[PDB]
Ligand binder design. Structure first.
Ligand code: HEM
Ligand code: HEM
Lengths: 678, 682
């Protein structure tokens, strides 16, 4: 049980009488009053201690990545990696380390929708036996900016306009595209956010990245540059925008519920931890600077090497105490890992320690159960708001004769202390500049775009078309096109169409046709369809429900999560048409007999909004899902102009429908249903 | 200009060089580094001061009503009301007082959707010349619970489950309905939240209520019991649930955008302030106890008396400094007004002062520009975090010979001080009980349901069906039915159908057929269509766009906000099909020629999602909006099976369509398009 250490702070209230926070049994359903219809008394200590606690429940949300959810798990090392790192959690084959992971969007406040288009956070804590090590990563391998000092500019520009606080959880507004075009470094991450990575099917269907080049350091001080990757065992999968939008309203909790359900159902998600490892002398060898976080390292130059696997298999018991309070920091580093001179990383180190002071309102946040390491804390820190321990050492300073030298200094040679990479040097003048090696903002955006499938490329174009069309300022829109043109004239032209502008002439400076692997989502089928969701459209009239129940049982055999939908909650029915929507499902299947709710009297029940069943089937099809109908239910497909010969559309007997749907769910999205320019 | 007083703290950065927060011009686009590809230096004071400010930007959201938006405006008294109150802001005809109003939902966090189903906040500050007076109201006249001590219970049950923090901004889950059924006083507000009040078309189309009985007190100490009402001059209007859901996704900012736009466009919204006035000796004379916040006073017993009007005409300059930071309190009271022994109001007084300490992390939040009164602060308060003043009086205590008696005591007869209603008395034993007069939890929910139109009643039932069907626990659903049945056997029967439960046996103790005016939304057409939105569906091909532009100009004459939609942003086009949705508009009109995008090739384009023009027209129709088509565009209506002669459907020449659409917009929703229980029987 990854959560074991937390059991000692769990509080069970079952079978108990109500109390105040300072003990003593009470009742707290009536205010104390002066007379039957009298005023409430100030001496009502019960009322006040209860309302004061309530009044003060809220803490500031994260300044970024406010919207998110997490779970506990276990990371298992596949080997003794002492040849590349001194890091203890990687020191032995099969060595296990508890983890907690939080996934998130970036721009939106708490309560914003999971399926907004955004970069996503993928933050992992390893509670190692040598301290907490966090990889605070995203689901996209590059970031918008090259120097941490520019972070408030980026974030201000993306978050809501400061006059009216519009729009929520969206880059689709003037200030964001003003920034993207004024600060061209941003174009690469922008392309990723405009691809499927911006609207993932779930947290479980994302890869993860540390983004920055870090260093692995061995006991003897030897170093390697490293990129951290998390490779999803569930496969990458993305929504389509028009679906993400409806889902944002129909279930803002889509991703957090998905993770929760997967874990509760015993379908814990896994990711392999992989690294790219390159020598120090490669820092500038690949046509860009590895200190530049707006670039990724093509796998063709340095393949992924798998180090282990983490599985998330325990949900939190209290979301606030665990998920909300957890405080990640890239400065949570351990022996065997070191930083690089990445100027984005450099400033994060400051920011994440400082921000906790805001969010936790005091300096002792590492003492919160979710933040505590498992490995022991021994130092001369004292006091501070909410000090939860009682220190025994009264000689809280070093050096000292009186404490006999304890706690003692640890370094590279004694006590397994942290140490900076011995070979690192500094040379040159102090400066407020960036290396000219950071200057190319367009080659990699082109590389990424090149590496997507034709429809996948169209999604990127259509996302930009959608977003930029919201920009009211004409010149910003032209500025955007000028910058896009530097990446691809074709991209610029196709976007320009939507904006009713003329794209600039070709500017071939950065154009090229190279491609790289591992960045596409839609070029590969899913490795498993376990946990995927099938909505079975039925009806309470006739024999449909019994067949739907039979269909459900067979589908659940293949690890699928099945929802039988009908007009009302009859025996066997999981959800009403009123409550159902296609966004909730990876596949939509009309049970035989249910055609009766697609036309005629059966389709006009006051029990659901007009057209509801047809809409679900229509949405499912247009959004590229496998859709099917059993037996006579094929009339339902006919009612919406859909034909059986189409890819990802299935009809016939129950056996045949199940087989096709299950194969279709591996394809996941049927891209033949989306038009491409030309 | 209601914001005039705020000008002194406004900061203009145009034409200036960048500085630190302690002055000194700087650059702050590059971190200071030890060498060309070097590590960042700790001595980079510029970096740290910039990022420290960024790092500490957020403050806690409000514990309830975290999601909302506000505006500045002016309140004008219609007369000298000194005959009923000593309140200075009501003391002369035409007297003007600056106001700020924040509207909100309740359950959802910041960032949740404006069109979630929920009670809505309607909080108004009057910056009077005798201190700040806040009416902290909602858009529904009754509250869930009868004693403030139960607030954390209600709120906890309605907010997301504490294990996984699901669901956001919704009562549609087990714990909420467990609470509603375990604590039946909640049933009244529940019915209102399940009506159109739960899903208003905008903040501008809501009424407002103080909910509690308060007291108006004259100079001589005579009091009357009072209910505060805000009556929208824009008329009440609501969405349908299936619409509100899509809108939550398509535009989470729908309501804050609507208010912002109305104000920017010079279409400031207004509400009349009205009161019901009750004799003290009639507190329990109307079939319930006026100290009970779960009850409203039927207007048949005590009609609304209009005292004045408030108009919101200025948007904020900085949302955070103004809207987010403003701190309302029902304890913000002034001479001429007093509290009552309403046990819910009673505890609010404590909670709103205390909670500011959490949100603002300090005791000086009244010093923030948006919280400051216009009338002057003089007392012996000192220090505290963030103290923004420098006090001159060194004898900061009373009584005192050394300060000559200043600041001096003010009371009823001296210095126009606040005073508690002199006639108020306490009688009886100290108790942790509620008056038996509070016992009836079903009569008024029944009264409210009786007072809605048939389709309006259907909306309530369908909302309950939708919500309750989310409850996983079977006993909880049965508990809910047992409670609904105490209100109305037919309601429980109709809801039971959805849940697959047996229609309960009548339990007539509280049943009655009484009706009251002023609670329906749909039984009345809008007084104005100004600001309402028309989506004109057009095309870049052919002559459609030119005709669309003409249609637009005429519509705009009648005060409408018109969006011309096409495949891409050609000249005259306001929005692409890709970016458009029916939820954005109050009416949808297909411009002549646009029928080409409803079928065949024109409907197949990489520029928008398959079926988008059709989906917009379909949604508009199904959600009860006025829909229309000019000339040949009638083919678009045909394509979605809509007959040209239905109510709320307009087809013909440009002139006729404009006429019909403008007429339909006053009706606003065409309720004939919604099935009522029994309709589908053979
Ligand atoms: C490679 C670039 C970056 C990545 C991958 C990244 C990732 C993340 C993630 C995943 C979180 C959410 C952690 C959680 O779930 O609690 C987060 C939060 C945060 N980030 Fe970053 N971020 C990056 C750049 C930056 C920069 C440049 C800054 C400032 C210099 C910054 C400052 C912050 C702050 C202040 C928080 C809030 C932390 C808290 O409140 O606990 N980030 N970031
Ligand atoms: C008639 C019943 C009630 C009404 C009409 C009401 C209305 C409101 C409104 C409109 C707001 C948001 C104000 C804004 O826009 O900033 C609010 C916030 C709040 N309410 Fe109430 N409420 C009621 C009951 C209660 C009760 C019984 C309590 C606790 C005893 C309570 C505690 C709070 C708190 C702590 C806030 C946050 C205030 C802040 O953070 O500034 N409310 N309420």
């Amino acid at each position: 049980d990854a959560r074991q250490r937390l059991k000692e702070v769990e509080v069970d209230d079952n079978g108990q009488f109500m109390t105040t926070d300072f003990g003593g049994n009470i009742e707290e359903q009536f205010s104390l009053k002066a007379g039957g219809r009298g005023s409430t008394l100030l001496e009502d200590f019960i009322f006040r201690q209860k309302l004061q606690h309530f009044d003060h429940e809220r803490i500031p949300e994260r300044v970024v990545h406010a919207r998110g959810a997490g779970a506990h798990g276990i990371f298992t090392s596949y080997g003794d990696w002492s040849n590349i790192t001194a890091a203890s959690f990687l020191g032995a084959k099969d060595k296990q380390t508890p983890v907690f992971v939080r996934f998130s969007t970036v721009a939106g406040s708490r309560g914003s929708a999971d399926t907004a288009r955004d970069v996503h956070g993928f933050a992992t804590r390893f509670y190692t036996d040598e301290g907490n090590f966090d990889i605070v990563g995203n689901n996209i391998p590059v970031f918008f900016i090259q120097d941490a000092i520019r972070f408030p500019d980026l974030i201000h520009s993306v978050k809501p306009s400061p006059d009216n606080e519009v729009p929520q959880a969206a880059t689709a507004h003037d200030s964001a595209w003003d920034f993207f075009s004024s600060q061209p470094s941003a174009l690469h991450t922008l392309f990723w956010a405009m691809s499927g990575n911006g609207i993932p099917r779930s947290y479980r269907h994302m890869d993860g990245f540390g983004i920055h080049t870090f260093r692995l350091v061995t006991e003897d001080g030897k170093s390697k540059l490293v990129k951290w990757h998390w490779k999803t065992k569930q496969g990458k999968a993305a929504l389509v925008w028009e679906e993400a939008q409806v889902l944002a309203g129909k279930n803002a909790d889509f991703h957090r519920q998905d993770l929760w359900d997967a874990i509760e159902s015993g379908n814990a998600p896994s990711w392999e931890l992989a690294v790219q490892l390159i020598d120090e002398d490669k820092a500038q060898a690949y046509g860009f600077d590895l200190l530049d976080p707006t670039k990724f390292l093509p796998e063709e130059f340095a393949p992924l090497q798998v180090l282990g696997e983490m599985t998330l298999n325990r949900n939190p018991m209290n979301y606030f105490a665990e998920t909300e309070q957890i405080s990640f920091q890239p400065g949570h580093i351990v022996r065997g890992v070191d930083f690089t001179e990445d100027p984005l990383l450099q400033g994060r180190l400051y920011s994440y320690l400082d921000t906790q002071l805001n969010r936790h309102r005091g300096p002792n946040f590492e003492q919160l159960p979710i933040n505590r390491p498992v490995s022991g804390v021994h130092n001369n820190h004292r006091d501070g708001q909410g000090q939860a321990w009682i220190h025994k050492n009264i000689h809280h300073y070093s050096p000292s004769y009186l404490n006999k030298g304890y706690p003692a200094q640890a370094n590279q040679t004694v006590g397994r202390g942290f140490f900076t990479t011995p070979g690192r040097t500094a040379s040159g003048v102090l400066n407020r500049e960036l290396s000219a090696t950071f200057d190319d903002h367009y080659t990699q955006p082109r590389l990424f775009f090149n590496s997507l499938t034709p429809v996948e490329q169209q999604f990127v174009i259509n996302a930009i078309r959608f977003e930029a069309s919201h920009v009211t300022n004409e010149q910003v829109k032209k500025n955007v096109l000028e910058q896009l043109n530097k990446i691809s004239n074709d991209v610029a032209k196709r976007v320009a169409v939507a904006l009713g502008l003329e794209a600039p002439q070709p500017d071939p400076t950065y154009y090229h046709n190279n491609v790289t692997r591992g960045v596409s989502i839609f070029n590969e089928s899913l490795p498993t369809i376990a946990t995927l969701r099938v909505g079975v459209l039925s009806t309470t009239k006739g024999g449909s429900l019994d067949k739907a129940k039979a269909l459900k049982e067979q589908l659940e055999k293949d690890g699928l999560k099945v929802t039988v939908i009908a007009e009302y909650l009859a025996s066997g029915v999981d959800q009403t048409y009123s409550a159902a929507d296609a966004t909730a499902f990876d596949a939509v299947v009309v049970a035989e007999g249910a055609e009766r709710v697609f036309s005629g009297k059966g389709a006009m029940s006051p029990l659901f909004p007009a057209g509801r069943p047809s809409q679900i089937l229509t949405d499912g099809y247009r959004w590229g899902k496998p859709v099917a109908a059993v037996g006579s239910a094929k009339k339902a497909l006919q009612s919406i102009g859909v034909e059986e010969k189409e890819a990802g559309v299935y009809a016939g007997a129950q056996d045949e429908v199940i087989k096709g749907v299950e194969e279709g769910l591996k394809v996941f999205k049927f891209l033949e249903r989306f038009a491409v320019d030309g």
